[PDB]
Amino acid sequence: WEIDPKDLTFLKELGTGQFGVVKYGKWRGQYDVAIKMIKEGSMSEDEFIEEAKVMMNLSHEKLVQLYGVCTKQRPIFIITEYMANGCLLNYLREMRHRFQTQQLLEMCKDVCEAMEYLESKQFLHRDLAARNCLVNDQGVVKVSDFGLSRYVLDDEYTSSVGSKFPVRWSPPEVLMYSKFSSKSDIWAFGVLMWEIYSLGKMPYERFTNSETAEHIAQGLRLYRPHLASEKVYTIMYSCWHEKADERPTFKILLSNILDVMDEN
Numbered sequence: 001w002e003i004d005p006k007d008l009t010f011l012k013e014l015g016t017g018q019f020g021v022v023k024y025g026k027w028r029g030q031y032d033v034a035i036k037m038i039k040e041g042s043m044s045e046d047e048f049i050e051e052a053k054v055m056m057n058l059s060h061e062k063l064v065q066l067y068g069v070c071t072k073q074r075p076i077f078i079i080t081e082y083m084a085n086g087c088l089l090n091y092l093r094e095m096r097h098r099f100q101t102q103q104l105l106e107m108c109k110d111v112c113e114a115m116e117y118l119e120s121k122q123f124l125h126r127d128l129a130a131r132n133c134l135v136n137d138q139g140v141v142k143v144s145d146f147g148l149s150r151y152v153l154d155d156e157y158t159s160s161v162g163s164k165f166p167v168r169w170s171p172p173e174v175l176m177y178s179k180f181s182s183k184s185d186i187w188a189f190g191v192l193m194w195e196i197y198s199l200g201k202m203p204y205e206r207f208t209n210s211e212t213a214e215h216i217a218q219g220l221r222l223y224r225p226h227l228a229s230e231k232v233y234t235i236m237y238s239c240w241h242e243k244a245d246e247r248p249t250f251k252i253l254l255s256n257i258l259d260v261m262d263e264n
């Protein structure tokens with residue numbers, strides 16, 4: 001969907017991301033949207049435009065929808081669903097003292113539903129983390145910016161030794177071989193559950209990226225957050241098998257989470 005930029009009203013600055021400026025606005029004076037203004041040089045644009053239909057056709061209640069693009073001008077725009085509560089990582093830290101454990105599990109379920117959908121579509125997120133989940137006005141968590149890491153033009157982000165590469169969310173085979181698969185998203189999802197249950201702490205805080213890489217390659221795993229039951233920790237820990245083929249699918253994780261909910 002090529003959106004007519006005349007149909008967009010910019011209303012508020014939402015900050016800056018790895019493509020530059022993002023704004024809150026309305027489409028046809030009614031629907032809230034977020035608008036990424038793709039900073040020139042920041043994205044592999046012809047690759048993106050060439051491949052974006054698959055990403056727009058991803059449709060699920062727990063994905064932050066890509067509604068369309070504006071490509072007949074520069075900078076190009078990516079128009080998405082608007083999420084009033086911003087990123088999950090901040091939401092966790094801001095409301096840290098208010099969450100009940102049932103709500104944390106619900107958040108895990110939301111993310112797991114989105115990822116099971118993506119898995120079913122053989123579509124990789126590649127940068128799953130609380131910072132890449134957003135929260136709407138009703139506390140529903142949704143997965144954002146799935147697939148976009150592929151188009152990033154920034155050596156600090158694209159190199160596994162870059163300062164921006166999501167090392168703390170990456171399995172050994174990504175760190176060593178750049179081998180992304182369903183099972184590297186699984187690993188990241190485990191780390192995301194850990195961010196949720198730790199109420200937004202940084203994974204491997206006080207370790208550098210390279211120290212993190214070194215020690216996880218040797219078997220170091222994130223400790224159980226105080227708020228995680230042993231059953232919940234078992235679920236997140238299952239995502240961290242050194243060998244990719246020993247990790248669960250998102251279908252299995254979803255069943256695991258639903259079982260805990262029913263037990264609860």
Ligand SMILES: Cc1c(NC(=O)c2ccc(C(C)(C)C)cc2)cccc1-c1cn(C)c(=O)c(Nc2ccc(C(=O)N3CCOCC3)cc2)n1
Nearest residue numbers: 014015016017018022034082083084085086127145148149
């Ligand atoms: C996704 C995003 C980025 N980041 C990126 O664009 C980005 C680009 C590429 C990547 C890859 C690395 C994966 C390629 C990652 C991220 C940067 C800035 C804003 C948003 C964003 C988006 N949406 C769709 C919202 O609904 C929303 N909503 C907000 C709502 C509220 C607030 C806010 O200021 N709040 C929250 C409520 O309490 C008051 C303070 C902030 C944002 N904020």
